[model samples]
Target: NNPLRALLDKQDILLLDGAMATELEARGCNLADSLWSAKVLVENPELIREVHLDYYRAGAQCAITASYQATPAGFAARGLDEAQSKALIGKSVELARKAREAYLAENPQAGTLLVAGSVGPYGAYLADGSEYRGDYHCSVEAFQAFHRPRVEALLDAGADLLACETLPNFSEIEALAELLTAYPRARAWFSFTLRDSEHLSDGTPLRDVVALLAGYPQVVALGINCIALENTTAALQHLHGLTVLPLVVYPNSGEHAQLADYLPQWQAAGARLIGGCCRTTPADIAALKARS
Candidate 1:
């Protein structure tokens, strides 16, 4: 059984950490480019672990790794070869695991902590905000091949599950789901960026995509992340009716002041997992934890 899914399945509300880049930015890491958190993974990996530890201290059950934009193609742009890129991808998981181990070493009864290797959308590597539009013109095999090495690296580095998140199209989700079959014991939760309250960023109906993913046991949870804060409630309600998979929501800081007000409504709508995305800080996650 997947330990993260086991925790989530038993109605244990898992608190995920807030934005990695936001914390890094506060600590003075320059993220004005494509690499995002992955850049910090190379130059300041210890700081990456530091941010993860802060989240743990603030009460996050899971530490999502700093690999959201750490694709091989993106690293190759920075003059890294495939081997180097794969190692960097693995380093993201290593940092999170280090944080989790450190946290548990002191607070041994903190319970089951998890490391979710983040596999962000290919469009994120484009660094043009195409992830919010999902207008890529690539084949499924192309997508699969591009994602394989990163997925392999994260799994090899000992992640509890894959965080195939902020994905905008069903095609990429299908490619990632197919890739997961090659690693039968692995589990993941898929979250999409929406174009509207009812549709994915690529304009696919959220309910239809959620239905399509219902057949894959490897995809243990489903929901939305990084969408507009106002759209979250309706999206959660509609998704709760479409499938029984545990729902995960991590809205960006569009409504930071009102997060406490919005969270209970999301919980009532069947969201078992919740956190923050871009522009959110540990303070945001601490507030979320307090509400939970």
Candidate 2:
């Protein structure tokens, strides 16, 4: 019943695309705005589509959309009306679909591929990077309200699933879990930022995140992303011990002229879904594919 399960039913591994904001920045987009890669949606969206295609050429099987900070409130702060702001969020998925069409047409024999609409943490909108520290707090209802429009926008735009990723707090995820119930048939994968091998960035035990998530069958996978390279092994081994759900690890690569060496170890440690996070490029993805 799960889209992720259906994919894994045919393939041994699912290779995810790497960093979007970093690639955009490298291509000359000034990402000083709090919107991050989302700003490109307002400026040069074609660049984003090309990047997704390049990653596909490099052997990435899943393209994660560049909506990490494209919140209605964040775009509202930039003078966009509520509906227009959400249109930008929808545009993120459109860019990926355009890219996917290009990739599939050229390589119709390629294995499964889908677009994951990114839902970054609230701190991502602040531009202060508190998402990694997660010291901020808010009411559960407030988080649900804040996340609703963008989530709806992505679904309406035809995203295959929501990449509820880089999360650091339990309250936000708790709110998001409640939000997912409204879209009962939709699927998602939750990726967290970590404080340690055993804990999430907000001090919740990794096992406890698993415990609470066990009820959300729509969440087809779980793991960490945008974390330090050193911490991944222990955290992944820990998560593997706790659940049978496929694990995802797309850690930050700084400038990713680096990979291949770690791919085997990660696969060995149970990261069924793997790729780079910040600063990873098509070259790194190509190197990673070489190992596959």
Candidate 3:
């Protein structure tokens, strides 16, 4: 069984680490670059590990690596060669694992935790606003080629699973689903940016998205992320009965800090994997743990 399913088998609710970029920013890292949190993968890697350790201490069961926008092309734009970019991508998982080791040594009772490689969409690499608009289109094979190296790097670095996240396009989803078939043993959870309570950021209806993804058994979970907190439960509700796949929800921190107050509604809507997105901190994750 995969890392995500194994964890779900043992617990009703799995806690994912909160936003990596925001956490690092809190620790004095400026993330206005295209690489996002992955910039720290080069600037100060120790801070990245510390952020992961903080999440684990705040009761996260899974740490999503800081490779969301770490594609070789993006790094290449910043003058990093192919090899160095791959190393930085791989470092994302290694640092998270190191943090896991540190956290485990201190908390033996903290059952098994997993590291999920963060695979942001092609739009993220473009560093444009298209991720929210989902206007880009390309052949699935091209998408596979663009993503293959990073996926290989993350897996080779010993990630437990892939957090295929912030995807706004259906074509990219198809690309990732096709890409996963190459690694028969690998598993990933798919989370998208949302346009509303009933549709993906790209405007694909949840029903159509569910139907298209039903063939890819490698995608172990599906739902929404990086959206408003108020939109989360309804989106999960729309996705809940669409398939048996576990629903993942990690909405951005909205106007209020009392995030746990919405947990019951999200749980009722069948959100099995929970965490925070943009503007979320360890304190937010701690609140989630306390109410979970």
lDDT of 2 by residue, 15-97 (tens): 89998776777888886667655467767989999999999999888899988888888887777877997899899999999
Q: Could you give candidate 3's per-residue lDDT for residues 1-292 as a string of tens digits?
A: 6677677888778888887777677778886777665567777999999999999999898999988888877887778877888899999999999999999999998998999999989988876877776889889888898888889899989998899988899888988988989988888988998788778888888788888888888888888888888777778887887876888989888754476678788888888898998888888888889997
Instruction: Itemize residue pairs with steric clashes in candidate 2.
Output: none
Q: For residues 116-138, could you state the per-residue lDDT of candidate 1 as single tens digits?
A: 99989988878788889998868
Ordered by lDDT, highest first, the candidates read 2, 3, 1
Model-by-model lDDT, in order? 0.85, 0.86, 0.85
| Candidate 3 ranges with C-alpha deviation above 4 Å | 36-38
Question: Which regions of candidate 1 are displaced past 4 Å?
Answer: 9-12, 255-257
RMSD of each: 1.5, 1.5, 1.4
RMSD of candidate 2 to true structure, Å: 1.5
Candidate 3 versus the native: TM-score? Answer: 0.96
Off by over 4 Å in 2: 36-38, 254-257
